[PDB]
Amino acid sequence: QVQLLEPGTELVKPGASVKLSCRASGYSFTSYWMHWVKQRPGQGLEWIGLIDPSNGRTNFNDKFKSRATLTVDTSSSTAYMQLSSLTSEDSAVYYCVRIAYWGQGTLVTVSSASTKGPSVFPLAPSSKSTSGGTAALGCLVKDYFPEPVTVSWNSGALTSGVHTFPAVLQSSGLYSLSSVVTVPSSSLGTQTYICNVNHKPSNTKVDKKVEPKSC
Amino acid sequence: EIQLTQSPSSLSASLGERVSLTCRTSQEISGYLSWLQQKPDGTIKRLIYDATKLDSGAPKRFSGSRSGSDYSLTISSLESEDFADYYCLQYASFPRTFGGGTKLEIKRTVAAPSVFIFPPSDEQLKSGTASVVCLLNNFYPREAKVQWKVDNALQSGNSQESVTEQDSKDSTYSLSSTLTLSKADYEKHKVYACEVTHQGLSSPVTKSFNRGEC
Numbered sequence: 001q002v003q004l005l006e007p008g009t010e011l012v013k014p015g016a017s018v019k020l021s022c023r024a025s026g027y028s029f030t031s032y033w034m035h036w037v038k039q040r041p042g043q044g045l046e047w048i049g050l051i052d053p054s055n056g057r058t059n060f061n062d063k064f065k066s067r068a069t070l071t072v073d074t075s076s077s078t079a080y081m082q083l084s085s086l087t088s089e090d091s092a093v094y095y096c097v098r099i100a101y102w103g104q105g106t107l108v109t110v111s112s113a114s115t116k117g118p119s120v121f122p123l124a125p126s127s128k129s130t131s132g133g134t135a136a137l138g139c140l141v142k143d144y145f146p147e148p149v150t151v152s153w154n155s156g157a158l159t160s161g162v163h164t165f166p167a168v169l170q171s172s173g174l175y176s177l178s179s180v181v182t183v184p185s186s187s188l189g190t191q192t193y194i195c196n197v198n199h200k201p202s203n204t205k206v207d208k209k210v211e212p213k214s215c
Numbered sequence: 216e217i218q219l220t221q222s223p224s225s226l227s228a229s230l231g232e233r234v235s236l237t238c239r240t241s242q243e244i245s246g247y248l249s250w251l252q253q254k255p256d257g258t259i260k261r262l263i264y265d266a267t268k269l270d271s272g273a274p275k276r277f278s279g280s281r282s283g284s285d286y287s288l289t290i291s292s293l294e295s296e297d298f299a300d301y302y303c304l305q306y307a308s309f310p311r312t313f314g315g316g317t318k319l320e321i322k323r324t325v326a327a328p329s330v331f332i333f334p335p336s337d338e339q340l341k342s343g344t345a346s347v348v349c350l351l352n353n354f355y356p357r358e359a360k361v362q363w364k365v366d367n368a369l370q371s372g373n374s375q376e377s378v379t380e381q382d383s384k385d386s387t388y389s390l391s392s393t394l395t396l397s398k399a400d401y402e403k404h405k406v407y408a409c410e411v412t413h414q415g416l417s418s419p420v421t422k423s424f425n426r427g428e429c
């Protein structure tokens with residue numbers, strides 16, 4: 001019954017600000033402090049601060065005092081966190097939290113990069129890629145922005161042996177991801193291998209055939 | 216600020232095993248501590264509050280105890296749902312602070328990776344950049360060391376890697392590493408290699424190719 005509702009994902013430019021909402025329900029809003037927590041990707045939890053919605057009083061982590069603003073709208077049972085002068089170090093999931101109940105979080109990405117669909121390159125099966133009776137093959141999904149990308153193989157008909165990796169953020173500000181599958185080296189002449197790449201943020205789909213061929 | 220020191224950082228264990236996680240405080244917090252669980256999907260749930268009280272929504276296999284500045288989370292008999300990340304939180308002092316986390320993963324036997332190397336595609340080379348990819352497939356444990364060499368010269372700072380989540384069927388990990396060179400650099404050298412070490416390999420495994428040669 002107690003619920004905390006946050007937006008999904010947000011892209012923001014460096015030096016800009018972000019204002020996140022947290023809509024509360026199922027309890028008396030002014031009766032519990034509302035906290036904000038940050039989590040950088042693959043890192044731990046960090047406390048930003050709290051606001052008491054009954055009187056607007058706040059308490060902050062010194063580390064965020066200079067750039068975070070907490071408010072509430074008691075009429076809509078919504079708490080807000082504004083964070084300014086953003087840098088890449090502020091890319092993170094942000095959660096609103098009250099005692100016993102944690103929000104789902106909002107993913108904030110700080111970037112000056114522009115939308116760009118991927119270039120899909122073959123990771124072609126070779127002798128330098130063939131463990132005994134097994135060959136590895138794949139697709140390199142490079143230079144796209146923002147996340148995410150999804151990959152399938154033979155329209156999801158091929159799933160066993162597939163490994164689609166977390167993307168990395170390159171120094172360029174664009175992402176790169178690989179997707180591999182291991183298959184019998186003997187199938188490379190009877191069966192076609194195609195990676196199905198979809199970049200929803202640019203509504204782009206790419207289907208690329210991955211071939212050994214002559215050389 | 217009151218520092219919470221969590222240990223172990225990572226713990227490997229089996230279904231059914233009893234385990235305990237510890238959180239130590241830099242100052243006295245008198246029992247004002249909770250234990251939080253974060254699922255592999257990101258969702259966070261409270262298991263214990265007031266150091267030793269069970270959250271109404273948490274199963275009974277979770278217990279909390281403490282003595283002075285030592286707080287422990289115990290799982291009586293591990294189930295599959297329990298492999299996740301765990302954090303302590305104190306609420307005795309401002310600012311509120313968290314432990315650094317403990318990652319609980321499923322223990323299995325050592326499995327050496329299968330290693331594959333991929334040269335840049337012709338398609339990519341046409342446009343100026345060369346990416347070389349080394350794949351480490353279905354290994355355990357997760358710790359693995361990949362080194363790139365170009366004409367036997369050890370490379371530094373020009374590669375990135377990522378690792379999959381622990382496999383649901385076989386509890387292994389896989390790893391992808393990408394070496395990025397400009398095309399100009401790539402065409403000035405011949406031998407490209409990835410050298411792998413892992414608990415499962417009695418000696419390093421090197422996969423290599425010579426540029427422009429099938």
Ligand SMILES: CC(=O)Nc1ccc2c(S(=O)(=O)O)cccc2c1S(=O)(=O)O
Pocket residue numbers: 033035097098099100101249250261264304306311
């Ligand atoms: C007195 C008391 O119980 N304080 C608690 C207890 C639990 C808390 C949680 S938890 O429920 O996720 O562990 C999350 C955020 C704040 C919490 C606070 S407080 O900072 O609001 O005081």
